[PDB]
Design an enzyme around this catalytic site. Sequence first.
Site, PDB file in Angstrom:
ATOM      1  CG  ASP A   1       1.415  -3.244  22.351  1.00 52.65           C
ATOM      2  OD1 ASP A   1       0.366  -2.876  21.936  1.00 52.65           O
ATOM      3  OD2 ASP A   1       2.163  -4.139  22.097  1.00 52.65           O
TER       4      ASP A   1
ATOM      5  CD  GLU B   1      12.145 -20.362  21.082  1.00 52.45           C
ATOM      6  OE1 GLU B   1      11.338 -21.296  20.697  1.00 52.45           O
ATOM      7  OE2 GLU B   1      13.328 -20.863  21.030  1.00 52.45           O
ATOM      8  CB  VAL B   2       7.251 -17.234  25.531  1.00 48.93           C
ATOM      9  CG1 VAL B   2       6.764 -17.713  26.829  1.00 48.93           C
ATOM     10  CG2 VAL B   2       7.349 -15.846  25.129  1.00 48.93           C
TER      11      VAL B   2
ATOM     12  N   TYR C   1      10.670 -10.634  18.585  1.00 45.50           N
ATOM     13  CA  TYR C   1      11.673 -10.482  19.886  1.00 45.50           C
ATOM     14  C   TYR C   1      12.241 -11.886  20.114  1.00 45.50           C
TER      15      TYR C   1
HETATM   16  C1  LIG Z   1      -6.110 -22.581  26.894  1.00 42.67           C
HETATM   17  N1  LIG Z   1      -5.193 -23.006  25.893  1.00 42.67           N
HETATM   18  C2  LIG Z   1      -5.985 -23.459  24.698  1.00 42.67           C
HETATM   19  C3  LIG Z   1      -4.140 -24.112  26.474  1.00 42.67           C
HETATM   20  C4  LIG Z   1      -3.255 -23.391  26.771  1.00 42.67           C
HETATM   21  O1  LIG Z   1      -2.610 -22.852  25.890  1.00 42.67           O
HETATM   22  C5  LIG Z   1      -1.629 -21.634  25.927  1.00 42.67           C
HETATM   23  C6  LIG Z   1      -1.296 -21.668  27.356  1.00 42.67           C
HETATM   24  C7  LIG Z   1      -0.371 -20.566  27.483  1.00 42.67           C
HETATM   25  C8  LIG Z   1       0.051 -19.801  26.714  1.00 42.67           C
HETATM   26  C9  LIG Z   1       1.316 -18.732  27.035  1.00 42.67           C
HETATM   27  C10 LIG Z   1       1.694 -17.756  26.024  1.00 42.67           C
HETATM   28  C11 LIG Z   1       2.555 -16.882  26.696  1.00 42.67           C
HETATM   29  C12 LIG Z   1       3.212 -15.834  26.107  1.00 42.67           C
HETATM   30  N2  LIG Z   1       2.883 -15.407  24.842  1.00 42.67           N
HETATM   31  O2  LIG Z   1       4.056 -15.044  26.668  1.00 42.67           O
HETATM   32  C13 LIG Z   1       2.861 -17.122  27.935  1.00 42.67           C
HETATM   33  N3  LIG Z   1       3.649 -16.452  29.025  1.00 42.67           N
HETATM   34  C14 LIG Z   1       3.550 -16.769  30.209  1.00 42.67           C
HETATM   35  N4  LIG Z   1       4.190 -15.757  31.188  1.00 42.67           N
HETATM   36  O3  LIG Z   1       2.844 -17.443  30.746  1.00 42.67           O
HETATM   37  S1  LIG Z   1       1.803 -18.623  28.443  1.00 42.67           S
HETATM   38  C15 LIG Z   1      -0.304 -19.970  25.479  1.00 42.67           C
HETATM   39  C16 LIG Z   1      -1.387 -20.776  25.058  1.00 42.67           C
END
Ligand SMILES: CN(C)CCOc1ccc(-c2cc(C(N)=O)c(NC(N)=O)s2)cc1
Length: 279
Positions: A129, A21-22, A19
């Site tokens: 999903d 990236e974020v 898709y």
């Molecule tokens: C606890 N951890 C070990 C530390 C933080 O790690 C993170 C934090 C946020 C995300 C995130 C991934 C995604 C996504 N794939 O869409 C997010 N999307 C969103 N709307 O916030 S936050 C992914 C990993």
Amino acid sequence: AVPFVEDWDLVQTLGEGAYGEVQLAVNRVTEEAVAVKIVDMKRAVDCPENIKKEICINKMLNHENVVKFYGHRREGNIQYLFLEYCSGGELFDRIEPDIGMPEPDAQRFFHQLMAGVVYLHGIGITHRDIKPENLLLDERDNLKISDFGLATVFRYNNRERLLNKMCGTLPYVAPELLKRREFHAEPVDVWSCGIVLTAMLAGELPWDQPSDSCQEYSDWKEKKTYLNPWKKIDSAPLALLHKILVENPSARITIPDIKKDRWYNKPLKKGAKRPRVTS
Ligand SMILES: CN(C)CCOc1ccc(-c2cc(C(N)=O)c(NC(N)=O)s2)cc1
């Protein structure tokens, strides 16, 4: 009036995929953190239409257990979707392989998942999903349903539309999607929530897919709950799973009845620890 307040620095990749990236975006002035989903519309012929649908659905959503949509900006062929940032990451990463998580934590997340799904179904949207990768956590471990790229309208002007599109993720998908031409939307989401519950309580997925060709699925229909993952799950939540993971979607438990389930209502989980002192 305040200069620079519409400028955001993209500081960290949060997720990647086909898709796009974020990215984590931080406001230049206020330091507010938001997530920005970046989609290149030239990556597929029907992406312009797909992303437009995702945006339209996102504009409908306003619930504490659904990732909030702040708006979007288009710059040439790139769409930027501004979204509520969930700093706790994916529910997927709170599930310990072969263990799961503490039952009270699973119950709390399940309550929040049900709240989000009730909300979506109430406005006539199905996610299609549901899985731990698409269930995010905020800074207080509140669950947020994420990613409306496969979502669709199943009820409009009080009339239900039956679905036929084969979509989702096989280990989480309901058996009727593999067996029937058409199907009701709501029981499909109920089923995937049941697989999520199984994963949270056992740290493993029960089957590759819900087909009789799949031995683990056959074992479940034969009530062989002395086998894993079921052996790892206490009798109260297992009784709920017996009502959710029912092959006939018309006999499957509905959400209003999940909310009346014995395990669903069992006091298990203490509120978040708050500071105290003794005298
Ligand atoms: C606890 N951890 C070990 C530390 C933080 O790690 C993170 C934090 C946020 C995300 C995130 C991934 C995604 C996504 N794939 O869409 C997010 N999307 C969103 N709307 O916030 S936050 C992914 C990993």
